[PDB]
Structures are given as structure tokens and as C-alpha cells.
């Protein structure tokens, strides 16, 4: 029932880090009704209007010499500083995945099954999950739901394998992750 | 490898709502509860390693409020165009019978940042143990939000997340059941 | 260890 027009202002200060703190880039962005109007980019070193409505601000801010000089120092006094503050529990956050494997269909030997490897609860996102049949890798018939972000500093993903289980086959889901010395492995016996 | 830390703020009229948050690689580090003037860590452990003086966010938001008024006047009171959300319902971990989990309602790609979220179990609204995040940033300057409902799974319970937003023509109803 | 904000600046009036 509320029909009133809305008016929105957003501000983003973005610190982009490469090879640790070796290379840093600072982007300040002013955004009105979802459209960016002015930005400061540390690789340019001054404010630039992104739309015409932002030109008065770029001109006003760039006319203040000492202000621009502080904004340029902020790659050190803001970006590198905050990076250092959080490194212990963000860059270095390591959380082991819970990994299980199970057949999607209960069925006799010699029939066509989907074996499932759920890998959940891990951080960071970088992870490699491979399927093995009797000690041999299999890159055919592996299909994965891709990497999903739970918004709670964890990730999950499902990796499926289409196979025909045969009498002596032992199947292994292998997963490599920064949190773990050597790959994790979980088996399913036919 | 590359990383990105974002300080993201917003102020919205006429609702008079404002938020202040830091984001690391798409996850929230903290936001500031402006009413209590307290830093809210997304995980408890963060507050044991770092601090943030919450009061400072109020100064930024005061200036945001002033800028919004200036830009509103500058645009000749031109309002924001509503962008309606899309809504996914999922779980943080695989669902197993009689094993407590949490239902996630993920609301994505919407603006302005005002949304009404309802949890429905067997068709009736339920709020026991619910929590939610603040409005999270996106590179296109739209918003994301996560709502959570802890629950124990059964074959007898059916669930819906109902999302209301001004860019929709009718509430979005997203469904989930054990399968 | 203390996070620091960057200040929002006032637009041209």
C-alpha cells in the first residue's frame, strides 16, 4: 500500500589486493538510484565524473589539493592497514570440508547408478574434487552442481558420477583443499 | 591470489534506513548496528581478533543522508526504478531425516533495499529461531539478502519463503520439501 | 587491531 517514490544513495570503498599487499587499488564510488555518478580510482589519482550529475562533485573535490593527497595515501593507511587487520581470519581462514558419498539409487550390481559426493562446510572456495574407480581417475560422466556460497563463510558443492557398479569395484571420492595436508578420500564399496 | 575488501554504505528515503558494512570476497565481516552503536561480527570469532569503533559509521551515515538530499534535489526529485528480486530456497548442508539443518531464503538482484520475508511451514507462518542478514552488496549495485530458518527435516513438513517487494506485481512464493 | 573506515565526503552544494 506504500506508493511513495524512493531515493537511494550508495557508497562503496573497494580495496583490490594482488599478490597479497604487493599491488593495491582503491576505488571509491558514489551511486545515486543505482547509477554511479562520481568515482575516485587510485590508478588515476583524482575524482572523475561517471555521469553528468557527478561533474560538480568531481570538480569540487579535485580542487582541494590536500584532500586528493590524503585519498591517494589511503591505499596504505586504509587498504593495506585493514588487510593486515583481518588477514588472520579472512585470507587465512581454513575450514575443513565434510565429505560423504552414497549411491543415489539403491539397486543391484551391473545396473546404471549415480554416485554422489557431497562436500560441504569448507572455506576458502578453491577446491578440487575427483572421482576414482578402483584407483583410476574418471573424468567422464562426472557432473557437478558447481560451487555455491552459503553466505556464512562456508561453501558447498555436490559432485555426481554416473557409473555401472560391478562386483569388486571400490569407488573413491578424492578432494583437495587448502585446509588439508593431503587429499581427503571416502569410499563406497559395490 | 586476488582479494577484495569493500566498505559499503547506503541511505534510503523516505524510509530513513541506512546500513554500514564491510565485505571480504563476497562474505560479510561486520556491520554496524546504528541504534545500539555496536559492531556486529558475522562470526563470533572475528571480534576476538579485531575491533571497529561503531560510532564512526554514524558520522558517515550522517553525510550520506546529506548527500542523498543534495542528489535528490539535483535530479529534480527523480526516484529510483524498482528492480524486483529473484528468490532461491536451499540448505547450507545436505538434508537428512531428523538431523537439524537451516533453510536459506536467498533474495538477489533487487533494489531499493526494502523487502518483506515470511516463512511458511505447512502453509502457516513460523518465526521460531529465524534470523536474517543485512542488505549485502553486488557489483551491479543491486542487493542480496539471506534469511534463515532452523528446522529438523521430516517427510511431513512443507515450506515456503514468501518475498514481497515493490518491483514485484505479486508476492514471490518459493517452495521446499524433503526429496 | 583496529579496522578504519574511509570518510564519506560531502557533495558540492
Amino acid at each position, epitope marked *: 500500500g506504500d506508493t511513495r517514490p524512493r531515493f537511494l544513495w550508495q557508497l562503496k570503498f573497494e580495496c583490490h589486493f594482488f599478490n597479497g599487499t604487493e599491488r593495491v587499488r582503491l576505488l571509491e564510488r558514489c551511486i545515486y538510484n543505482q547509477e554511479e555518478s562520481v568515482r575516485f580510482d587510485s590508478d588515476v589519482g583524482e575524482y572523475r565524473a561517471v555521469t553528468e550529475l557527478g561533474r560538480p562533485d568531481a570538480e569540487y573535490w579535485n580542487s582541494q589539493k*590536500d584532500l586528493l593527497e*590524503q585519498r591517494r595515501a589511503a591505499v*596504505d*593507511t586504509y587498504c593495506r592497514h585493514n588487510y593486515g587487520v583481518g588477514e588472520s581470519f579472512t585470507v587465512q581462514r581454513r575450514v575443513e570440508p565434510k565429505v560423504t558419498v552414497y549411491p543415489s539409487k539403491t539397486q543391484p550390481l551391473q545396473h546404471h547408478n549415480l554416485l554422489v559426493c557431497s562436500v560441504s562446510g569448507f572455506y576458502p572456495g578453491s577446491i578440487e574434487v575427483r572421482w576414482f574407480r578402483n584407483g583410476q581417475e574418471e573424468k567422464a560422466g562426472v557432473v557437478s552442481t558447481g560451487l555455491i556460497q552459503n553466505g556464512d563463510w562456508t561453501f558447498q558443492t555436490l559432485v555426481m558420477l554416473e557409473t555401472v557398479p560391478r562386483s569388486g569395484e571400490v569407488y573413491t571420492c578424492q578432494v583437495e583443499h587448502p585446509s588439508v595436508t593431503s587429499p581427503l578420500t571416502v569410499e563406497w564399496r559395490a | 591470489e586476488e582479494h577484495v575488501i569493500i566498505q559499503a554504505e547506503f541511505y534510503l528515503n523516505p524510509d530513513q534506513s541506512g546500513e554500514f558494512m564491510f565485505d571480504f570476497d563476497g562474505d560479510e565481516i561486520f556491520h554496524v548496528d546504528m541504534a545500539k552503536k555496536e559492531t556486529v561480527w558475522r562470526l563470533e570469532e572475528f571480534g576476538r581478533f579485531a575491533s571497529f569503533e561503531a560510532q564512526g559509521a554514524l*558520522a558517515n551515515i*550522517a553525510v550520506d543522508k*546529506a548527500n542523498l538530499e543534495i542528489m535528490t534535489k539535483r535530479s529534480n526529485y527523480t526516484p529510483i526504478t524498482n528492480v524486483p528480486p529473484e528468490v532461491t530456497v536451499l540448505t547450507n548442508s545436505p538434508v537428512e531425516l531428523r538431523e537439524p539443518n537451516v533453510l536459506i531464503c536467498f533474495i538477489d538482484k533487487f533494489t531499493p533495499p526494502v523487502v518483506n520475508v515470511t516463512w511458511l511451514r505447512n502453509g502457516k507462518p513460523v518465526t521460531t529461531g529465524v534470523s536474517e542478514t543485512v542488505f549485502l552488496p553486488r557489483e551491479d549495485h543491486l542487493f542480496r539478502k539471506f534469511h534463515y530458518l532452523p528446522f529438523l527435516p521430516s517427510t511431513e513438513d512443507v515450506y515456503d519463503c514468501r518475498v514481497e517487494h515493490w518491483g514485484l506485481d505479486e508476492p514471490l512464493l518459493k517452495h521446499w520439501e524433503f526429496d | 587491531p*583496529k579496522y578504519v573506515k574511509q570518510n*564519506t565526503l560531502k557533495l558540492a*552544494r
Partner: T-cell receptor
Framework: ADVTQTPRNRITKTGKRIMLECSQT?????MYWYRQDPGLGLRLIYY???????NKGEISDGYSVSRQAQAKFSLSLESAIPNQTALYFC??????????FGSGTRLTVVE | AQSVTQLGSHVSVSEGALVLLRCNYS??????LFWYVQYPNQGLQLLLK??????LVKGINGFEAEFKKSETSFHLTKPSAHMSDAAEYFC??????????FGKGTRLHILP
């Protein structure tokens, strides 16, 4: 003359509530009340980052403030005592640590 | 912020000689640093402001100050003391928290 304080000079007896007023013309969100005493520098009493926003400083005991409007910041001695004799300075700050101090209020509290 | 320490509540300098007023600071974050002057029967005037833009900060009247992180110092200097430099001088710090915390002040006395 962006920052104006009144009164400039005040005597008061102890035990009384006393109000000092600060007004600004620059529209700054940040305002501050400090007091200055020989050998202690300026100490921050209270500060405000927005309308109705109130934060205690180093020495807020025996003081209160109100910030009903952006242009004005009021300091009250709740129940004046002699050691609140001092020079009181209000200040504003812009968004990049540019402070403007008022001219000062010389307040003497006598028994 | 956290703290600033000025040395000496009253100090002297001969007319014409170098002025040096000492300030050391304590801060967990890269600070804003300031020097203010209060001339007799007046208010507070900013002399100079460190913003991390540069270690050598220049102010009005020949005042300067060098930010030295390794000794956490920010000492104020002026090449030649004039009688009109008689005043009280305050160093100050902010731990990027939108509040200035002042040192105790040093009163400079000029010997004619």
C-alpha cells in the same frame, strides 16, 4: 565566524544547572565540546555525529548535551561545582579532519 | 585516538634561535597528527596537519614538522623565534576515529 558560542563569559554559583550554546553556519554533521585547563590540554566532554546522536568523551561526568538540530550543540553543567571553572570550546569538523573551534566560553563557578 | 605526550609545560628559547617543540604519539593505526597554537587572549589555530601524504609537513610562518614513525615523533620546528611566537602549543592525534585527542600543551617563552 562559522562557529558562535554564547555566552562568552559567565559566573555561576555552585549547585546550579548552567547551559552553554554553540551554533554553526557550515552544516557540519560532527560537533564537539572540549574544556581547556592549565596543564591538561583540551579534554573532550561530549561529541555528536548527527542530530540526536550523543557520545561521551573523556570527562563527561557532571555534563550533558543535546543535539536537537544540526546547527546547534548545547552543553549543560548538571550541577555546577568549582572545578568546572574552565575555558569551554565547541568545535565542528568537516569530512576530512578540518576542525573549526569556537572562540571559547570562560566559565567561573564560585561557591 | 590513543595518546600524545608533550615534554615540558613551560619552555624557553632565545629570540632569534631555532624553535623545537617535542611531541611523541601512541597509536595502533596510521594517525592524523596536528599542531595547534593558542595566542594570548585568543582561541585555537591549526598550524599543521599530518595526513600520511608526506612526512615533512609545512605550515604557516615557517612552521614545519617531520613525521618519524620509527621514533613515533612529530616535533614542531620554526627556524627563528620571534617575540610574537610566545603562545601555548598543543600536539594532537586521531586514530582515524573522527575525534582529536590533545596533548597537555607547552607554553613557549621567548627570551628577548
Amino acid at each position: 565566524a562559522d562557529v558562535t558560542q554564547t555566552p562568552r563569559n559567565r559566573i555561576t554559583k555552585t549547585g546550579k544547572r548552567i547551559m552553554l550554546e554553540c551554533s554553526q553556519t557550515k552544516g557540519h554533521d560532527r560537533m564537539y565540546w572540549y574544556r581547556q585547563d592549565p596543564g591538561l590540554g583540551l579534554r573532550l566532554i561530549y561529541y555528536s555525529f548527527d542530530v540526536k546522536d550523543i557520545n561521551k568523551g573523556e570527562i563527561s561526568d557532571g555534563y550533558s548535551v543535546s543535539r536537537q538540530a544540526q546547527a546547534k550543540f548545547s552543553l549543560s553543567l548538571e550541577s555546577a561545582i568549582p572545578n568546572q571553572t574552565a575555558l569551554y570550546f565547541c568545535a565542528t569538523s568537516d569530512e576530512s579532519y578540518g576542525y573549526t573551534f569556537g572562540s571559547g566560553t570562560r566559565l567561573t563557578v564560585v561557591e | 585516538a590513543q595518546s600524545v605526550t608533550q615534554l615540558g609545560s613551560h619552555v624557553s628559547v632565545s629570540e632569534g634561535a631555532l624553535v623545537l617543540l617535542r611531541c611523541n604519539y601512541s597509536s595502533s593505526v596510521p594517525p592524523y597528527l596536528f599542531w595547534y597554537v593558542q595566542y594570548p587572549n585568543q582561541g585555537l589555530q591549526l598550524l599543521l596537519k599530518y595526513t600520511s601524504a608526506a612526512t615533512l609537513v609545512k605550515g604557516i610562518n615557517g612552521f614545519e614538522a617531520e613525521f618519524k614513525k620509527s621514533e613515533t615523533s612529530f616535533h614542531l620546528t620554526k627556524p627563528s623565534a620571534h617575540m610574537s611566537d610566545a603562545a601555548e602549543y598543543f600536539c594532537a592525534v586521531s586514530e582515524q576515529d573522527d575525534k582529536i585527542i590533545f596533548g597537555k600543551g607547552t607554553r613557549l617563552h621567548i627570551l628577548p
